[PDB]
């Protein structure tokens, strides 16, 4: 295929991601952003190659709110996950998601163009955190470990933890931070599968 064809396909991919964003589908945005990133890496296309093709596309204020929600949660989580127990795999994974979302935005926006989010569409932090973790669980290698635990498995364990906080009405930044920073140090057995 030609560069012109590959650019048109990348454009379609970017649009798929943007459509998911508009639907507030967190899982589906993250997968589509990843499919965009994969295809452009395969085709040696960079953000500046796509950008002039997206000139008449727009990320909506709702879209920006979702992107903002993701950004805040990922920023916070990458940092909280860096501890004296380990500071490589869990921050890495979370940071790599965040970059993937910046990549989508960079395909559309020039340097330093600000997002214009509509606060009405802010997604709760605990729901964003579960979305990010579910995506990590999907893209993690089967043998990936965070400290002594299987990554997928710890992702399931933290998900349950956040969901339990929701159920006892005890979600706040401190309680979320305490799950995000945990490496399951107090668990009697190491998590597998």
């Amino acid at each position: 295929v030609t560069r012109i064809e590959n650019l048109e396909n990348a454009k379609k991919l970017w649009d798929n991601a943007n459509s998911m964003l508009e639907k507030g589908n967190i899982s589906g945005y993250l997968k589509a952003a990843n499919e965009l990133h994969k295809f452009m890496k395969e085709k040696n296309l960079k953000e500046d190659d796509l950008r002039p093709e997206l000139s008449d596309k727009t990320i909506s204020p709702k879209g920006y709110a979702i992107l903002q929600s993701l950004w805040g949660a990922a920023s916070d989580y990458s940092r909280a996950a860096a501890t004296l127990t380990e500071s490589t795999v869990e921050p890495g994974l979370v940071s790599a998601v965040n970059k993937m979302s910046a990549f989508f935005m960079d395909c559309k926006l020039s340097p330093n163009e600000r997002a214009t989010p509509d606060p009405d569409f802010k997604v709760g932090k605990s729901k964003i955190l579960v979305g990010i973790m579910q995506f990590i669980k999907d893209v993690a290698d089967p043998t990936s470990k965070i400290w002594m635990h299987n990554t997928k498995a710890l992702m399931n364990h933290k998900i349950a933890a956040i969901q339990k906080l929701e159920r006892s009405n005890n979600v706040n930044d401190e309680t979320l931070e305490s799950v995000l920073s945990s490496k399951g140090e107090n668990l009697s057995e190491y998590l597998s599968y």
Binding site: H37, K38, K41, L67, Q68, W71, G72, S75, D76, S78, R79, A80, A82, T83, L84, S87, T88, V89, P91, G92, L93, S95, A96, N98, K99, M100, S101, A102, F103, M105, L109, P111, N112, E113, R114, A115, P117, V139, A140, D141, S144, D173, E177
Partner: protein, 168 residues
């Protein structure tokens, strides 16, 4: 294993030369498939102070130029915050001043901060008065550094790590 892990936040727009501040940090090394395709937004290094082994982990947080409302992502969850403006660019200074005023409003006194005036290239024009930036920096009670010379950047990181260690 470390005695301490200090988290640093690098705040700056594109085009202010943030790369310049990260040359004594390195990327961590991954086999993780998903990370290997995209990379991460932090870099690392180890230092020793007073017999104690300290990891410094610095986040140049991906996407930050898009979300410049000052939220707890900017003012909480970091030991140190480094804010970089471009000396050739008055609007750059004006933006960072604003960001730092707001960060000062909400952050703990226990967070170390640093204002950096960077000038990437020998040949563009300087326009931000260091007296004015220094006057601004003193007002919030934070250090100020003008950078091009890699040497003084290393000194600044070392001083910041020393100061963080005294409070932790």
């Amino acid at each position: 294993e470390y005695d301490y892990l200090f988290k640093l936040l690098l705040i700056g727009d594109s085009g202010v030369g943030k790369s310049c501040l990260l040359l004594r940090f390195a990327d961590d090394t991954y086999t993780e498939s998903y990370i290997s395709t995209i990379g991460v937004d932090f870099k690392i290094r180890t230092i020793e102070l007073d017999g104690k082994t300290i990891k410094l982990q610095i986040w140049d947080t991906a996407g930050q130029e898009r979300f410049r409302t000052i939220t707890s992502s900017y003012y909480r969850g970091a030991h140190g915050i480094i804010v970089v403006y471009d000396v050739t660019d008055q609007e750059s200074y004006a933006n960072v001043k604003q960001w730092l005023q707001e960060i000062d409003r909400y952050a703990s006194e226990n967070v170390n901060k640093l204002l950096v005036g960077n000038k990437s290239d020998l040949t563009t024009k300087k326009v931000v008065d260091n007296t004015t930036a220094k006057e601004f920096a003193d007002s919030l009670g934070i250090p100020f550094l003008e950078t091009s010379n890699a040497t003084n950047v290393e000194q600044a990181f070392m001083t910041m790590a020393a100061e963080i260690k005294k409070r932790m």
